[PDB]
Design a binder for this molecule. Sequence first.
Ligand SMILES: [Mn+2]
Ligand SMILES: [Mn+2]
Ligand SMILES: [Mn+2]
Ligand SMILES: [Mn+2]
Lengths: 460, 456
Amino acid sequence: KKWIRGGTVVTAADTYQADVLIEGERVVAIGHQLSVNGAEEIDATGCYVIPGGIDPHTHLDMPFGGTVTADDFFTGTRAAAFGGTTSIVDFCLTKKGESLKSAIATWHEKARGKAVIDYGFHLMIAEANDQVLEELESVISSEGITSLKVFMAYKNVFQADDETLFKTLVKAKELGALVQVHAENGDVLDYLTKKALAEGNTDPIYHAYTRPPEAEGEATGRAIALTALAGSQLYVVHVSCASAVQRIAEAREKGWNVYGETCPQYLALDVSIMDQPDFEGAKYVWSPPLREKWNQEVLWSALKNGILQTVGSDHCPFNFRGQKELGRGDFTKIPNGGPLIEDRLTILYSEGVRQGRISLNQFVDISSTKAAKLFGMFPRKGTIAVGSDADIVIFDPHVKRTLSVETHHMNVDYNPFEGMEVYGEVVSVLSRGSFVVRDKQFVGQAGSGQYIKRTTFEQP
Amino acid sequence: KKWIRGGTVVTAADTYQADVLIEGERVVAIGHQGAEEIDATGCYVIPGGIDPHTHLDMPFGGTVTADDFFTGTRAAAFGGTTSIVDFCLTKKGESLKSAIATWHEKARGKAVIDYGFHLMIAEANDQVLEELESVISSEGITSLKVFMAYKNVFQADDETLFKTLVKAKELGALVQVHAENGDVLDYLTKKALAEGNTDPIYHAYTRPPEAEGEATGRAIALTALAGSQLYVVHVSCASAVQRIAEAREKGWNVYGETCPQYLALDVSIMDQPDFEGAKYVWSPPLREKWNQEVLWSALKNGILQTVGSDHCPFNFRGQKELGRGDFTKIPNGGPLIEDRLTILYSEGVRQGRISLNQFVDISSTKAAKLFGMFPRKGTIAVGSDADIVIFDPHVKRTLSVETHHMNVDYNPFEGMEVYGEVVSVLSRGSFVVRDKQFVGQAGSGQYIKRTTFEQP
Ligand SMILES: [Mn+2]
Ligand SMILES: [Mn+2]
Ligand SMILES: [Mn+2]
Ligand SMILES: [Mn+2]
């Protein structure tokens, strides 16, 4: 038994002052004057009390290049916890000619004992031959997985043809699974990529100009069209640019079940930061690339008027030295990815709520709740109500602080928002009503995290 | 020397009454005040049809298209058209020159009217990208079909599609696309068989408009990315006109074509008892009647700008019969070459959807300027080849197999009451048809070597 009193609680809907009362793992009662017989106090006067961040886009301990992502399931989840997030959903990668159960098995072992907070998996689909379509039944029922990434880019590495894409959409309809897509046209990027090399433009900046917004717009559009044709449901990850928001809007006007996600870097960074003398642009090499500043407003507007509806990290980080160095000679060999898991929550807060782009209630919805409802964790996660796992987060909105590698908790040598002056700070984080962070101290234990078995798809 | 007097001449721009004067193969002077007279009092005098979408003597299935380059071009001439552009099909692992060679031989001696070639592109590996220079300079070819559908038969991936667009930019070639998503159609197709829906009607429901809208959108997006120029063939539905419109508003060089069947027929005609729907099996399929208005509006306000037949005909007996058991085997195609000109007239001008001037532009001129045959073809001016057509707008007549000139057992517009009739057709100032008689000779037709791309 724990007792948070003094807090102003904030959810996707409600904003009120009251004490919450946790017993075991779950919130149990909310109000004035509860029955707190002999239970641990926690003072939350002055602070906001909010549900835990859910971060539906994480690639922890992944290979990309012959090298692996810096954070593991321990370093990763900890950093998430530090930066306000209590539950992640990671991308289980399948390898053509692939026991689907054996890939999953691998991702479980990658977590077990390391993870401090709760976590779930998405399942990547490489080919959708008869073999794989069969296995999908097992996984949705037994293995607690009900969402499915298809990459339309990374040619000869992860890329899938329209066939795979469509068969997977129609199955997903049949089984009740959200399909997700990395919507860029591999084929046009490969050509532009191999051409820019032909001409000796090897700098990291040419990572951005070799995958123009027109190519995201196109694949997003395409993936929407098949979803329409299949009668299925879509979640475009990482929308970076206006060309795609346009395509998502358009479909959601015709009432189809299309969904959208950004990340902070597209909300808070632009291309100009890559044009930088020495290898400094490799800090920003990730896909889709950073875009022109015009697009930040459009992305924001979309979140605000409910056109996009979740925010993830796409945390996939690599060290500037040694790792992002593989590829001094050419940008194709820069492993693509950023360290974004930690600051996410608070940049949403500081740049968004605090400068009047979204409401405080939307900030929760956009970082926590809506991601639970799409990925079938609701109401175990993503809210403060009676029954809900006690994934609470006390949050002090008055602190002003500068984001930095000197002070962050991810296991990497840089921070893409290095130097950003920012409001808000994570005081304490509970996961199923146990401290992971207290007064900004790691009091958690490795292995405490539990796998979340998600339910099948249901609108919002 | 020939002398057409009494005519009211009609072009893409002009409408006036005057005598034109042909000498040799070319119009030579026009105006008021020992040469062969031809009376055109009462009739319209207009430039020859150009039909930029023909598949004459083509294989599809293990069978071939009914009309050859003789029967075909004659029928065109009968129905008002003087110059065609046919689709030279390339096979993977393909001497590009040898494919062309084959398409020349298919014509030589058979063709009665003038003709050119498009070049199909199957793969755009280094080999083929190299050859393309020879062809655009030497072989007179400056337009290129890539099919995005017919999986494992003609279909190209986005790679081939993009490379070709960027090369086209580089050489000055119009790229053309058949814009349906092969992949989604294959699934829907093999699924509709799984369930035992083998009637010809399921040809239409296995390739919904959404899939044309998609490939159209897609092929437009690459064009933007390549800075190259596009011509979507056969736009059948609103989903694609939408996509074309949108790009043209942003000022890219995207072009659009329909055919009469999509202006004048709808799906309901397929739902018909016995194998009668197979008469309408072709790709894209007939659409709901809502779309005909949208297509017509586009032509009118200059969103689409050309009209072709996609003439690719097969006999209802024996040939269309190939797939009584299942619609995948029905060779996809219609007999559309002959009536095209006059359905554009009667349904379009006559019922007040287009102007008389636009009728020429939409059937003749604009196709010349996009395919690089202008001003040799597609107008009545001093210098232009005398591909004239005397045209009587007052005749009422019923379109029928009993009376048509294509070498096939049916007519898809069979029974349509229609205004207008082709009296006489000149090709380079020689009669191909006189007072509705075939006075032409096989082999008289000449290959037209087209120039590179330039706007409009
Ligand atoms: Mn991605
Ligand atoms: Mn990702
Ligand atoms: Mn076609
Ligand atoms: Mn065709």
